[PDB]
Amino acid sequence: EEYVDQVSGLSDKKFQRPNDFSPPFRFGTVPNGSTERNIRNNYAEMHAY
Amino acid sequence: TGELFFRSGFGIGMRKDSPWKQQVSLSILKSHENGFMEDLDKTWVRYQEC
């Protein structure tokens, strides 16, 4: 028994619905970057969280 | 099963000189930066039945 870990992507329930699940998940990065600007222009609520 | 090799992407073909070339070359980048391509992928490719 081994190798049990997988996620779908940026459309998963873990990213879209942090509160409507197990204790809130965590994910982030540094601000003032291209990835931060892209995720802010794409997913407002995800960035706010 | 296996590892990728000779990873070359697809593309839209056209003649040697045409404004439609640059138009499509900009529209594809805009779609990629917007999210349309991700929706198309998750709709027509990401079946995930197993």
Curated annotation (Swiss-Prot), chain A:
Task: Give the top-rank taxon of the lineage listed in the UniProt record for this protein.
Answer: Eukaryota
Q: Which gene encodes it?
A: Grin2b
Name it.
Glutamate receptor ionotropic, NMDA 2B
Q: Which of this chain's residues carry glycans?
A: 32
Q: Where does L-glutamate bind?
A: 34-35
- Report which part of the complete sequence is shown: 657 to 705 of 1482
Localisation: Cell membrane; Postsynaptic cell membrane; Late endosome; Lysosome
Family of the protein in this entry: Belongs to the glutamate-gated ion channel (TC 1.A.10.1) family. NR2B/GRIN2B subfamily.
Question: Per the entry's comment, what about the domains?
Answer: The extracellular N-terminal domain (ATD/NTD) endows NMDARs with a unique capacity for allosteric modulation, harboring several binding sites for small molecule ligands that act as subunit-specific allosteric modulators of ion channel activity.
Report where it is expressed, by tissue.
Answer: Expressed in the hippocampus including the dentate gyrus (at protein level). Detected in adult olfactory bulb, brain cortex, hippocampus, striatum, thalamus, superior colliculus, with much lower levels in inferior colliculus, midbrain and cerebellum.
Functional note:
Component of N-methyl-D-aspartate (NMDA) receptors (NMDARs) that function as heterotetrameric, ligand-gated cation channels with high calcium permeability and voltage-dependent block by Mg(2+). Participates in synaptic plasticity for learning and memory formation by contributing to the long-term depression (LTD) of hippocampus membrane currents. Channel activation requires binding of the neurotransmitter L-glutamate to the GluN2 subunit, glycine or D-serine binding to the GluN1 subunit, plus membrane depolarization to eliminate channel inhibition by Mg(2+).
Entry PTM? Phosphorylated on tyrosine residues.
What is the annotated quaternary arrangement, including any partners? Heterotetramer. Forms heterotetrameric channels composed of two GluN1/zeta subunits (GRIN1), and two identical GluN2/epsilon subunits (GRIN2A, GRIN2B, GRIN2C or GRIN2D) or GluN3 subunits (GRIN3A or GRIN3B) (in vitro). Can also form heterotetrameric channels that contain at least two GluN1 subunits and at least two different GluN2 subunits (or a combination of one GluN2 and one GluN3 subunits) (in vitro). In vivo, the subunit composition may depend on the expression levels of the different subunits. Found in a complex with GRIN1, GRIN3A and PPP2CB. Found in a complex with GRIN1 and GRIN3B.
- Native species: Rattus norvegicus
From Swiss-Prot, chain B:
- Where do glycans attach? 23
Found, by tissue, as follows: Detected throughout the brain, in brain cortex, cerebellum, thalamus and olfactory bulb.
Places the protein is found: Cell membrane; Postsynaptic cell membrane; Synaptic cell membrane; Postsynaptic density membrane
As for PTM, the annotation reads:
NMDA is probably regulated by C-terminal phosphorylation of an isoform of NR1 by PKC. Its phosphorylated state is influenced by the formation of the NMDAR-PPP2CB complex and the NMDAR channel activity.
- Highest taxon of source: Eukaryota
Per the record, the domain comment is: A hydrophobic region that gives rise to the prediction of a transmembrane span does not cross the membrane, but is part of a discontinuously helical region that dips into the membrane and is probably part of the pore and of the selectivity filter.
What is the annotated role of this protein in its UniProt record? Component of N-methyl-D-aspartate (NMDA) receptors (NMDARs) that function as heterotetrameric, ligand-gated cation channels with high calcium permeability and voltage-dependent block by Mg(2+). NMDARs participate in synaptic plasticity for learning and memory formation by contributing to the long-term potentiation (LTP). Channel activation requires binding of the neurotransmitter L-glutamate to the GluN2 subunit, glycine or D-serine binding to the GluN1 subunit, plus membrane depolarization to eliminate channel inhibition by Mg(2+).
Q: Which family does it belong to?
A: Belongs to the glutamate-gated ion channel (TC 1.A.10.1) family. NR1/GRIN1 subfamily.
- What is said about its interaction partners and assembly? Heterotetramer; the NMDAR subunits are modular and harbor tiered domains that function in concert to regulate opening and closing of the cation-selective ion channel pore. Forms heterotetrameric channels composed of two GluN1/zeta subunits (GRIN1), and two identical GluN2/epsilon subunits (GRIN2A, GRIN2B, GRIN2C or GRIN2D) or GluN3 subunits (GRIN3A or GRIN3B) (in vitro). Can also form heterotetrameric channels that contain at least two GluN1 subunits and at least two different GluN2 subunits (or a combination of one GluN2 and one GluN3 subunits) (in vitro).
Q: What is this protein called?
A: Glutamate receptor ionotropic, NMDA 1
Q: Which organism is it from?
A: Rattus norvegicus
The lineage is: Eukaryota, Metazoa, Chordata, Craniata, Vertebrata
Q: Entire protein: which part is shown? A: 749 to 798 of 938
